[PDB]
Design a binder for this molecule. Structure first.
Ligand SMILES: CC(=O)N[C@@H]1[C@@H](O)[C@H](O[C@@H]2O[C@H](CO)[C@@H](O)[C@H](O)[C@H]2NC(C)=O)[C@@H](CO)O[C@H]1O
Length: 368
C-alpha cells in the first residue's frame, strides 16, 4: 500500500514494563523506531547497555524479528527529550557532522538496523533543562541531515542495501521557524510529525494532548490557536514537507491532573491541583491502564468535545481529568491521513497499548 505505520519502541520496555521486542505484533507496523541511542563525544552510542546490546539484548530480538518479517524496517532513534544536548555540537562543523554521520553508519551496521531517526528536541530553542542550542542550528539541522544522507547512501552502496533517514519534529510550529523543512525534506525518507504533547501537566490547567482542530473555547494563557493536529499538518505542508512524506503522530499514553474544578465543562480547560494518577509515573497513564481501570469506570466518566474532536475522562469525586486518544478521535485522524494523501501514522509508544485497541485500528485502516 501507500501508508507507513511507524511504532516507537522504548528501551525501558525491558524493565518493569516487561514488554520486549518479541511482544511486538510486527504484522501491525511497517517500521519500528528504537528509542533511543545517546550522543557521547559527538558520536551515536548505545543508550543502555543493560537492555540494548547486552543484558536483555533488545537488539538481538529486533534482528530476529527482521528475519521472521521481511517487510519490516527497524531504525535507531538518536536523541529524544532527555538526550538531545549533543546535537548542537555535532551539527556545528563539517568535521563534527562527518564524525557523527560515520558513528551512525557504524552503529546500524554493528546492531543490524535499517537506518536512523533524528529526534532532536529542538533546534535553536525548546527542550529539556540540560538541552544545548545555538542560532546556527537552523542552517546546521539541514547540513547534519545532508551529511547523514550522504554517509548512508555511500554505506548502502557498499553494503548492497538501502538505509532510511527520518526525523521526529515538534508539533509546535516554532520548529518550522527554527529549521528549513523545505531543504531537509529532500533528504529525509519521511518526517514523523509529533502531533501530540499540545497540553500536559506543565500547565496547571487541563487540556487535550492531541485535539484534532482548534477549539476557541480553550483560551488559557499562551496556549496557541495552532496547538492541534490539523494546524501542525497544514503548517508542515506549507513549510514544504511533501504530503507523501508527512507521517501523523498519535499518542498511546494519556496525561492526568488532580483537583480540577468542574466548571461548566466537567473539568475541561479548568484550574487543577497538580499531576493525577499515572502508570509508571504520576500524571502519565498507559492506554492499557486507562482502558482497564478508568474508561467509564471507577467514577471516571467519558466526555466528547465535538469542536476539538477529542474525548476526556473526569472523576467529579477527586477532580481528576484524563486526556487520552479515543478510537472516535483516531478514526477521524486516519480518515484525514487518506484525504490529504499523507505518509501514514506514527505512534508513541507501542508498549503503552497491550490489548492493541489503537494499534489494531491504525493497522486495519492504513495497511489492509
Ligand atoms: C505545544 C508545545 O510547545 N508543547 C510542549 C511539549 O512538546 C513539551 O513536552 C515534550 O514534548 C516532546 C514532544 O515534542 C516529548 O518528547 C517530551 O517527552 C515532552 N516533555 C515532557 C516533560 O513531557 C512540554 C514539556 O515542557 O512543553 C510544552 O510547551
Amino acid at each position: 500500500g501507500s501508508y507507513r505505520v511507524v511504532a516507537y519502541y522504548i528501551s525501558a520496555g525491558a524493565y518493569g514494563r516487561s514488554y520486549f521486542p518479541s511482544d511486538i505484533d510486527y504484522s501491525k507496523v511497517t517500521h519500528i523506531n528504537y528509542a533511543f541511542a545517546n550522543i557521547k563525544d559527538g558520536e551515536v552510542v548505545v543508550g543502555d547497555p543493560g537492555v540494548d546490546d547486552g543484558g536483555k539484548n533488545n537488539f538481538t530480538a529486533l534482528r530476529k524479528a527482521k528475519k521472521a518479517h521481511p517487510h519490516l524496517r527497524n531504525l535507531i532513534s538518536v536523541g529524544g527529550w532527555s538526550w538531545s544536548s549533543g546535537f548542537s555540537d555535532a551539527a556545528a562543523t563539517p568535521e563534527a557532522r562527518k564524525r557523527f554521520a560515520d558513528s551512525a553508519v557504524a552503529f546500524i551496521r554493528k546492531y543490524g538496523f535499517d537506518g536512523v531517526d533524528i529526534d532532536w528536541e529542538y533546534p535553536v530553542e525548546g527542550g529539556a533543562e540540560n538541552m544545548k542550542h545555538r542560532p546556527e542550528d537552523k542552517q546546521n539541522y539541514t547540513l547534519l541531515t545532508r551529511s547523514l544522507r550522504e554517509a548512508l547512501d555511500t554505506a548502502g552502496k557498499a553494503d548492497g542495501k538501502y538505509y532510511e533517514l527520518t526525523t521526529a519534529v515538534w508539533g509546535n510550529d516554532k520548529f518550522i521557524a527554527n529549521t528549513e523543512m523545505d531543504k531537509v525534506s529532500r533528504d529525509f525518507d519521511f518526517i514523523n510529525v509529533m502531533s501530540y504533547d499540545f497540553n500536559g501537566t506543565w500547565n496547571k490547567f487541563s487540556g487535550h494532548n492531541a485535539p484534532f482542530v482548534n477549539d476557541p473555547a480553550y483560551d488559557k494563557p499562551g496556549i496557541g490557536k495552532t496547538f492541534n493536529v490539523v494546524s501542525a499538518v497544514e503548517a508542515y505542508l506549507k513549510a514544504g514537507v511533501p504530503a507523501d512524506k508527512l507521517v501523523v503522530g498519535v499518542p498511546l499514553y494519556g496525561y492526568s491532573w488532580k483537583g480540577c474544578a468542574a466548571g461548566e465543562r466537567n473539568g475541561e480547560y479548568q484550574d487543577c491541583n497538580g499531576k493525577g494518577r499515572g502508570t509508571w509515573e504520576d500524571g502519565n497513564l498507559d492506554f492499557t491502564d486507562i482502558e482497564k481501570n478508568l474508561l467509564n469506570k471507577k467514577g471516571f466518566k467519558r466526555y466528547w468535545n465535538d469542536t476539538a474532536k477529542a474525548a476526556y475522562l473526569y472523576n467529579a469525586e477527586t477532580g481528576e481529568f484524563v486526556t487520552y486518544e479515543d478510537p472516535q478521535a483516531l478514526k477521524i485522524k486516519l480518515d484525514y491521513i487518506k484525504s490529504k494523501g499523507l505518509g501514514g501514522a506514527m505512534y508513541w509508544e507501542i508498549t503503552a497499548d497491550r490489548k492493541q485497541t489503537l494499534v489494531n485500528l491504525i493497522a486495519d485502516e492504513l495497511l489492509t
